[PDB]
Amino acid sequence: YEHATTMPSQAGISYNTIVNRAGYAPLPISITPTKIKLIPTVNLEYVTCH
């Protein structure tokens, strides 16, 4: 059963929802994001010092 939703990009806060199939019992879905990284593609050119 294809179910699409949307979650805000904010850590710590639990995000709750359910899935209502039209003649069955509602299925609850919970997603709590903990740590959301962002890792760029990093390319060393040179180092320097004294």
Residues at the interface with another protein (CB under 8 A)? 1, 21-24
Based on CB atoms, which residue is closest to another protein, 27 or 29?
Answer: 27
Using an 8 Å Cβ cutoff, are 3 and 23 in contact? Answer: no
From the CB of 23, what's the least distance to another protein, in Å? 3
Which residues have C-beta within 8 Å of that of residue 38, sequence separation ≥ 6? none
Q: How many CB atoms lie within 10 A of CB 19?
A: 13
Based on CB atoms, which residue is closest to another protein, 23 or 28?
Answer: 23
From the CB of 47, what's the least distance to another protein, in Å? 28
